[PDB]
Amino acid sequence: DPTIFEERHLKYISQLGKGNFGSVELCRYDPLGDNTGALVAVKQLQHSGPDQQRDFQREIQILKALHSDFIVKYRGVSYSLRLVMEYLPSGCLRDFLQRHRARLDASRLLLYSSQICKGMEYLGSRRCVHRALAARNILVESEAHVKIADFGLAKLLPLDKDYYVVREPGQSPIFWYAPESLSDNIFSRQSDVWSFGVVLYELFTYCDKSCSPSAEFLRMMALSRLLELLEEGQRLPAPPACPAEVHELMKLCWAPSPQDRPSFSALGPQLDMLWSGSR
Numbered sequence: 001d002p003t004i005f006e007e008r009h010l011k012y013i014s015q016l017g018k019g020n021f022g023s024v025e026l027c028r029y030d031p032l033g034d035n036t037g038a039l040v041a042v043k044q045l046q047h048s049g050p051d052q053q054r055d056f057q058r059e060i061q062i063l064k065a066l067h068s069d070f071i072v073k074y075r076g077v078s079y080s081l082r083l084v085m086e087y088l089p090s091g092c093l094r095d096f097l098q099r100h101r102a103r104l105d106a107s108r109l110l111l112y113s114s115q116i117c118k119g120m121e122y123l124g125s126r127r128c129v130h131r132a133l134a135a136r137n138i139l140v141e142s143e144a145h146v147k148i149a150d151f152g153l154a155k156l157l158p159l160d161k162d163y164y165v166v167r168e169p170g171q172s173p174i175f176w177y178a179p180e181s182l183s184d185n186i187f188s189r190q191s192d193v194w195s196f197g198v199v200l201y202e203l204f205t206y207c208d209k210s211c212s213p214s215a216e217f218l219r220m221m222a223l224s225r226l227l228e229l230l231e232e233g234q235r236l237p238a239p240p241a242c243p244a245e246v247h248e249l250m251k252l253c254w255a256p257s258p259q260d261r262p263s264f265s266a267l268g269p270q271l272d273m274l275w276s277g278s279r
C-alpha cells in the first residue's frame with residue numbers, strides 16, 4: 001500500500017485551518033529527512049466523540065473514491081486517524097479573490113465557476129451531496145484552477161431517495177442554505193445547486209466583505225427571518241459589475257422549488273459559453 005503515510009515522516013510545518021472538531025495542517029512528507037519531500041495537507045480530529053470518528057472514516061472513503069480534476073485529491077491516511085491530501089498552496093478561494101481582485105477579470109471568475117460546476121456535476125454523479133460549498137472551502141490550486149474541498153458535511157444519498165434529513169444541524173452558517181434546508185433540514189443535489197448560486201454571488205463580488213451574504217441579510221432586515229425573506233422571493237442583489245446572464249443563472253439556482261433549479265449538467269455549458277463570449 002502506497003496509501004499509508006508513516007506518522008514519524010509527516011513533519012509539522014504550520015496550521016492551515018481549525019474547526020471545532022478538527023483541523024488541517026501543512027506538513028512535509030519527508031521520509032529521506034532532507035526536506036526535499038512533498039508538501040501535503042493533513043486533516044485530523046480533536047475533542048472528537050465516536051460519532052465524529054465514524055463520520056470522518058466515511059469522509060475519508062468518500063474523498064478517496066472521487067477522481068476529478070476539480071476535487072481536492074486524496075493521497076492517503078496515517079494511523080489517531082489522519083487524512084493526507086495534496087497541498088493546494090494558494091489557499092481558500094474567498095481569501096484569494098480578496099487578495100488578487102485586481103488581476104482577476106470576469107473571464108477568470110467564469111473559469112472558476114465552470115470548474116466548480118464540473119466538480120459538483122461529478123459529485124452528483126456519485127450521489128454525493130457536499131452541503132458546505134462556499135468560497136471559504138473551495139481551494140485554489142493555481143490562478144487558473146480551483147477545486148472543491150472540505151467534505152466534513154458531505155454525505156452519500158440514501159440508495160432509495162434523492163434527499164436526506166439531518167437530525168441536528170449544529171451552528172453552521174445559514175446564508176448558503178436552500179429554504180428546504182433551513183425549514184426542514186433537507187439536503188440534496190438540488191440544495192447544492194442553491195449553494196452554488198451563492199458561490200457565484202461570492203465569485204462575482206470577489207467576496208468583498210461589505211456585500212457578503214451575511215452583510216446583505218443584516219441590511220435586508222435569524223433563521224426564521226431569512227427563511228421568510230426567501231419565501232417572499234427576496235434574493236441577494238446583482239453584484240456591481242456582474243454580467244446580466246450570470247445574475248440570471250444565480251436567480252435560477254435560487255428557485256424556491258428544488259425541481260425548478262437547473263442541474264449542474266445544464267449549468268456547465270451555459271457558464272462555458274458565457275466564458276467563450278467574454279474572452
Ligand SMILES: *CCC(=O)Nc1cccc(-c2c[nH]c3ncccc23)c1
Nearest residue numbers: 016017024041086087088091092136
Ligand atoms: C479561507 C480560510 C480557510 O478556512 N482556509 C483553509 C482552511 C483549511 C485548509 C486550507 C487549505 C489550504 N491548502 C490546502 N490544501 C489542501 C487541503 C486543505 C488546504 C485552507
Ligand SMILES: NC(=O)Nc1ccccc1
Nearest residue numbers: 175213216217235236254
Ligand atoms: N440565495 C439568496 O439570495 N439568499 C440570501 C438572501 C438574503 C440574504 C442572504 C442570502
